[PDB]
Nucleic acid binder design. Structure first.
Lengths: 205, 61, 82, 83, 71, 86
RNA sequence: AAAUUGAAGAGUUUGAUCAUGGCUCAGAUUGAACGCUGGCGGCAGGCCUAACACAUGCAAGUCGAACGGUAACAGGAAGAAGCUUGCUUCUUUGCUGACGAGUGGCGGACGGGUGAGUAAUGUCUGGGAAACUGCCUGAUGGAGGGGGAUAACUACUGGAAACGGUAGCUAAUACCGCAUAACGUCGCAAGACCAAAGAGGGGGACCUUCGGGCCUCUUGCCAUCGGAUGUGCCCAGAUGGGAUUAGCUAGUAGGUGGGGUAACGGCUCACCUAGGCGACGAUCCCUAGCUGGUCUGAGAGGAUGACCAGCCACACUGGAACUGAGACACGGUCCAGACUCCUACGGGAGGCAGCAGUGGGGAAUAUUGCACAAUGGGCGCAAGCCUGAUGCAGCCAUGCCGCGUGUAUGAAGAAGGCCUUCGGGUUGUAAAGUACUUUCAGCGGGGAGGAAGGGAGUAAAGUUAAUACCUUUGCUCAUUGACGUUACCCGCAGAAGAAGCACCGGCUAACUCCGUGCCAGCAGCCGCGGUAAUACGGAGGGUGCAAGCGUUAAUCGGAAUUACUGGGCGUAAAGCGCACGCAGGCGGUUUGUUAAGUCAGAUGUGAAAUCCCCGGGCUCAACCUGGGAACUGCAUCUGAUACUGGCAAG
C-alpha cells in the first residue's frame, strides 16, 4: 500500500523526530511535534515493554515507510544471509533504490523520491527502472530521466541537497544528475535514533 | 445447539442456517454459533463499528 | 530405444528447455535417464542459452538413440563443426 | 569374496530334512533411543543330507529360489553343537 | 438491468422441447442459452455500452393463497 | 456414442484365434501322440514319433504360435524321456 | 568453498505463598470455507465431499512411396453433342492428382485420469540369478521357388433398424506349402530341424507386350548374436493401530518324481514325508495407496503424502481369456451382474475415477474456450495427417509477491466533530489556497521472443550404371505465431478513475464521552453488566495491518504436559502386597584369539527439482534457472583392535 492521510501525525505517536515533511516550516512550527496526538496526548504514556519494542520496529518501518509484509521479508534476509542480523537488516533495507534517489537528494522527502522512481523518471545503469524498492547493487550509476531534470520537485530538492548531503558510501553529482552508489551498510553507514537489536529480539519469537 | 450472536432477534423458526464452531461457555452445551450474515437469518440490524462478525454491509452513502 | 529430445521447464512464454536422454513411451517431462545439456530459446541480452555435452551424445548414439527433430536442430544451433 | 552373499548363522531346527532352519542374531541401534539391540532374522536354507543339527553354527549363501521362502543353500558347518 | 459482466455460454434453438444447434444469435430470432443461471424474466441483455433496461416490466399478481408443508 | 476405430482389429483377432487354435491343436494332438508314444514303450515307434515332432514344433516356433523358449522346452523334455525308456 | 548464533513467555487455583498440575493465550502454516471490503500486473494453485448418476460435442490414428481396387471428388485427356470457332457442355477412359470402404501393415498395452482396493502375494533401500524384450543399434549369415483361400467387388436376399445373410470371383509386404538351414535349435554324439517379400525412386546399356525381365541405388523383410532400454522374478532390512485379537496353518511346511510358465517355484500335481508360522506379536480385527517430498520444529521429534515427481492399484460392478513383443486391456472382446437407451415390439445398444459441462453430494472449487504455431506422443521414406497430452487464453484477491492509489507546499491553528476544572485542548498541515508531476488505469501511435523447421533450386563431398536417382556439408530463393493489437516503448489528458478491515479492561499495542441498568449484550481466557460501564451499543480520539482484513476449521510448536535428546514415583498422579523364577535385560577379573557390533578408509549407490549455497535472467521481487553442497541411509572390500559381543584356557 501507500500509507497516507495525516503524515506528521504518525511520527508524533512515534514520539521523537523523523525525517518527514522537510520542505519547509514543519519542525516545531505550525505542527506540534512533541506532546502526543489525539485527545489523550496531553497526559503522559502508559507504555509497555512490548510497546517500546513494537513502536521502535514501527519507527524504523516508518522512517523508510515499508509495509510489514516487506519488512518480514527484510528480516528474512538478514537471517538468511551470513552477517549479523540487526546491522545487516539496516543494510538490506537501505539498498533500496527509492531511498537512494532520496539519499542523492533528488527529492528532499522520500515520498518525493518514491513518486519520481515509480512515475518513471529514474534510470539505473542507463536502464529504465521504476521498481521502487529495487536492489541497487554496490557500485552502480544513478541517473535521472532527461525530462525530469527540471520539475519543481527536482530543482528545489537539488538545492535542498546542496551542502546538506554527500555521505560516506555514495558520492553524487548535481549538474550531471548522477550519483555513484558506493556500497551497502555495515554497522557504521546508517542510523538515526533507531533500535535494531530490539527488533531482532521482536522478530525471533 | 448453537448460540446466536447479536441482537435484532433470532430468525427462522423452521429454516436454514450456516453454523460455525465456537463456545460461549456460560451456557450449557454451546459449541456453535450461527453466522448471521451468511445464508439466511439476516445480518444484525443496525450497528456501525462491529460489523464483520455478524454482517453489516458498509452503512450506506 | 530412447531419445535425445527436449524437456520443457520454467514459465509462461519464457520456457527453459533442458535437454534429456529419455524413455520412448513416456511424458516429455516424465521420467529420464541422463540429463545432458541445457537449452534456452530466450537468449535475449544474455549468453549461455545453449550448453551441451557432445561426449554423452556420442555415447547414446553408438548404443542406439534417435535425436529429435528439434534436438537435431540444437546440433544445427551449436555450430562447432563449421 | 568381491560381492557374494555369504553369511554365518545359528541352526535352530532340523526336523524335516532338506529344509534346514537357520536363525541369525543381528545387532542394530534402536533408531531413536540408542541401545544396540537384537532382532533375530530367521531363514530357510537348503539342506541336502542332514549335515546340520540343532545349536549348530553354519554358513549359508544365496542360491536362488528352490521352494517357497527357500532360496539359500547351506555352505559349511563351522561348529556342530559338539553332539 | 443488474449491471454485471456476462458470457453467453452456448446458444441452442428449440424444436419441440428437444435441442437444435445453431452457434450464434442475430436480430429477430428466439432461442435459449445454456446454463446462464442467474437471470430473471424481464432482464435485458445488451451490447457492451448496452441499452440498459427496455420498457417491458408489467405482469399480474397472485389471486389466491394456500399454505404448504412437505410430508 | 460408439467404438473408435477398433473394429478391424476386433474382427481380425478372432480369425487369428481360430488360426492359432488350429495349429496349436495340430501340434497338441502331436504332443499327445508323443507321450502316448512314450507309453507305448518302444524306442523305435516313439523316436519315430519324436522324429515326427521335430519338423512339427519348429515352424510353430518360428511363426510365433509357441515362439520364445517355448519350443525348446517341449522339444527337450520329452526327447530324453524316450531315452530313459529305452 | 558453505554447516553458520529458528534451543522467549504470559494469565488462571490462595487471604497471600512456593510447589504440583490441567486449561487458555501471543508464532508460523492451508487444496481452505465465510462474513466486510476491494485498483493493477505478475506467478502459482483451483471438487479434499459421492470412486455418485452422467445430457451434448470432443480426448487415437495412419500408410495409395503394402494390396485388390476405383463410389467419391478433382484435373488432364479420346470421341461426340451444342457448335461458340475452338470454346462450353456431355459420354467414356485410373490417364493423373487421388482416395470412401475393404483385404492387409503398424500405433489403440504410450500419453491422461483416478486412490476404490491393498498393511508391500506391487511400495522404500540395497543386494540377487533363473529370465524375456517390437522398434532402435552392432556384427555375421539369408532371402530360391511355388500353392491356395478370402475381404471388397459383384449377383442374390433379410431386417421399420442396429446389424445382416445366401452365391460366385480376385491380390498382396495377409495365409499356406516347398527349397535351402548356422556361430543356431534339440541332443553324448551320431543325427534331426525350422526362415523371409517384396516394394519404391531411378536407369547410362542389353533383353523385351519398356507389361516387364534386367541394370542401379534407397528401403523394407528373414536366421543367429550382442548392444540398449523396458518389463517378469527373488532375498534381507524399514512401514499405521488394537492382545478387552493368542494359538494360526495342511497344497500348509519340506522332499521325491511327472506337469507347467518366457523362467526357478506345491506355480500345479500325484506320490510322499511331517512339518512351517507365532509374544523379536503369527493370526484376527480396525484403519491406510506409496515414496521423493510437503508442513512444522533448534535439533531430535511430530504431523503429512494429486502442488510436483518416480512408484503402484483401479477402469459401470463381477469374472475370464484372447490378441500381441508388450495386457489380462481408460475410449476391445466374452460371460454374468446392477443401471440406463432405441424400438422396431421382433430384437439390439451403452459406461465422463479422459476434456469441457450437467444434475446429486457438500462449507467449498472453474471454460460445453483458442490452436497445432512451439514442445512432445502416434503413423508415415517424407510432404503430411493425427494431438481436450501440450502450450496459452477464459473464470475465482485462493495463496505468494510486486506495484498504484499524486507529491511537495500549506493556519498561526478555519467550519463541522469531540471532550471542556468553559481556561481551552483535540481532530490537524488534516482541510481550503499554492506550485510540481502522471506509475497503473483510460486513451492514440510504434512493437522483442517464442521461428527452430520444412518446401523447391544450382552445385558437390559422394553410389557415382559419368553429367540420373539418391545424398548431404553448405550454398539458393520464396518462407513458418494458438496467445495477439503480448510484454516492451513512445505519446496525450488530469490531482485526477481508486482503500478497506479489525482492534483499544489485563493477557495484547490503544481511550474517552454518551446510550442500557443482571438487562440489552460481549467472552480465546480471566470474566464483565445489578446507576457515572476504559468490556456491552454508538460518537469522538487512538493502535494494528492492508487489497485485503477478521473469524471459525486444520497441523506443529509454545508443551520439558508421553520427556531418546528431556520428566516422575514418602505425602501432590505415581513402587506391584510379598517372594521364587522362565524368557529377556544386564556381567567381577585375566590371558589369548576371533573380528560380529565398533571406528577409520575406499569404491558403488542416495533419480529430477525440492531444501540449503554461490551465480544468472524476466525493469526487481514473486519467479525461473547453471553449478556447488547437502543427498542425516544402505552396499562391499581393505583397515584400526581399546571398548563390547563371540570363542578357548584362568
Amino acid at each position: 500500500a501507500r500509507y497516507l492521510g495525516p503524515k506528521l501525525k504518525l511520527s508524533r505517536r512515534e514520539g521523537t523526530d523523523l525525517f518527514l515533511k522537510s520542505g519547509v516550516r514543519a519542525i516545531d512550527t505550525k505542527c506540534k511535534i512533541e506532546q502526543a496526538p489525539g485527545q489523550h496526548g496531553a497526559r503522559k504514556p502508559r507504555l509497555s515493554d512490548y510497546g517500546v519494542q513494537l513502536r521502535e520496529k514501527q519507527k524504523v518501518r516508518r522512517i523508510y515507510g515499508v509495509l510489514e509484509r516487506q519488512f518480514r521479508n527484510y528480516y528474512k534476509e538478514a537471517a538468511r544471509l551470513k552477517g549479523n542480523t540487526g546491522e545487516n537488516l539496516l543494510a538490506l533495507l537501505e539498498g533500496r533504490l527509492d531511498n537512494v534517489v532520496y539519499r542523492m537528494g533528488f527529492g528532499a522527502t522520500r515520498a518525493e523520491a518514491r513518486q519520481l522512481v515509480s512515475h518513471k523518471a529514474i534510470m539505473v545503469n542507463g536502464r529504465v527502472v521504476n521498481i521502487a524498492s529495487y536492489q541497487v547493487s554496490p557500485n552502480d550509476v544513478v541517473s535521472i530521466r532527461e525530462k525530469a531534470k527540471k520539475q519543481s520537485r527536482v530543482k528545489a530538492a537539488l538545492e535542498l541537497a546542496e551542502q546538506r548531503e554527500k555521505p560516506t558510501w555514495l558520492e553524487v553529482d548535481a549538474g550531471k544528475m548522477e550519483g555513484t552508489f558506493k556500497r551497502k551498510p555495515e554497522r557504521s553507514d546508517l542510523s538515526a535514533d533507531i533500535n535494531e537489536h530490539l527488533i531482532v529480539e521482536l522478530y525471533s519469537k | 445447539t448453537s448460540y446466536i450472536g447479536g441482537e435484532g432477534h433470532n430468525l427462522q423458526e423452521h429454516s436454514v442456517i450456516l453454523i460455525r464452531g465456537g463456545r460461549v461457555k456460560d451456557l450449557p452445551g454451546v459449541r456453535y454459533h450461527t453466522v448471521r450474515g451468511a445464508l439466511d437469518c439476516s445480518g444484525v440490524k443496525d450497528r456501525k463499528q462491529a460489523r464483520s462478525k455478524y454482517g453489516v454491509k458498509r452503512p450506506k452513502a | 530405444m530412447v531419445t535425445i529430445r527436449l524437456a520443457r521447464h520454467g514459465a509462461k512464454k519464457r520456457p527453459f528447455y533442458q535437454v534429456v536422454v529419455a524413455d520412448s513411451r513416456n511424458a516429455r517431462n516424465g521420467r529420464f535417464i541422463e540429463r545432458v545439456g541445457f537449452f534456452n530459446p530466450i537468449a535475449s541480452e544474455k549468453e549461455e542459452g545453449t550448453r551441451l555435452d557432445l561426449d554423452r551424445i556420442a555415447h547414446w548414439v553408438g548404443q542406439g538413440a534417435t535425436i529429435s527433430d528439434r534436438v537435431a536442430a540444437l546440433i544445427k544451433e551449436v555450430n562447432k563443426a563449421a | 569374496t568381491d560381492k557374494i552373499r555369504t553369511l554365518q548363522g545359528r541352526v535352530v531346527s532340523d526336523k524335516m530334512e532338506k529344509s534346514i532352519v537357520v536363525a541369525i542374531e543381528r545387532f542394530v541401534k534402536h533408531p531413536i533411543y540408542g541401545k544396540f539391540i537384537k532382532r533375530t532374522t530367521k531363514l530357510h536354507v537348503h539342506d541336502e543330507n542332514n549335515e546340520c543339527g540343532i545349536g549348530d553354527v553354519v554358513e549359508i549363501r544365496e542360491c536362488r529360489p528352490l521352494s517357497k521362502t527357500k532360496s539359500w543353500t547351506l555352505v559349511r558347518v563351522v561348529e556342530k553343537a559338539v553332539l | 438491468v443488474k449491471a454485471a459482466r456476462e458470457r453467453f455460454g452456448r446458444i441452442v434453438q428449440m424444436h419441440a422441447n428437444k435441442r437444435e444447434e445453431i452457434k450464434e444469435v442475430r436480430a429477430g430470432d428466439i432461442a435459449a442459452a445454456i446454463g446462464l443461471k442467474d437471470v430473471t424474466t424481464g432482464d435485458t441483455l445488451c451490447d457492451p455500452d448496452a441499452p440498459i433496461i427496455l420498457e417491458r416490466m408489467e405482469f399480474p399478481e397472485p389471486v389466491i393463497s394456500i399454505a404448504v408443508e412437505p410430508k | 456414442a460408439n467404438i473408435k476405430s477398433a473394429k478391424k482389429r476386433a474382427i481380425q483377432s478372432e480369425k487369428a484365434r481360430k488360426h492359432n487354435a488350429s495349429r496349436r491343436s495340430m501340434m497338441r494332438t502331436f504332443i499327445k501322440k508323443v507321450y502316448a508314444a512314450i507309453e507305448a514303450g518302444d524306442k523305435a515307434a516313439a523316436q519315430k514319433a519324436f522324429n515326427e515332432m521335430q519338423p512339427i514344433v519348429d515352424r510353430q516356433a518360428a511363426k510365433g504360435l509357441i515362439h520364445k523358449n517355448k519350443a525348446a522346452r517341449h522339444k527337450a523334455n520329452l526327447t530324453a524321456q524316450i531315452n530313459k525308456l529305452a
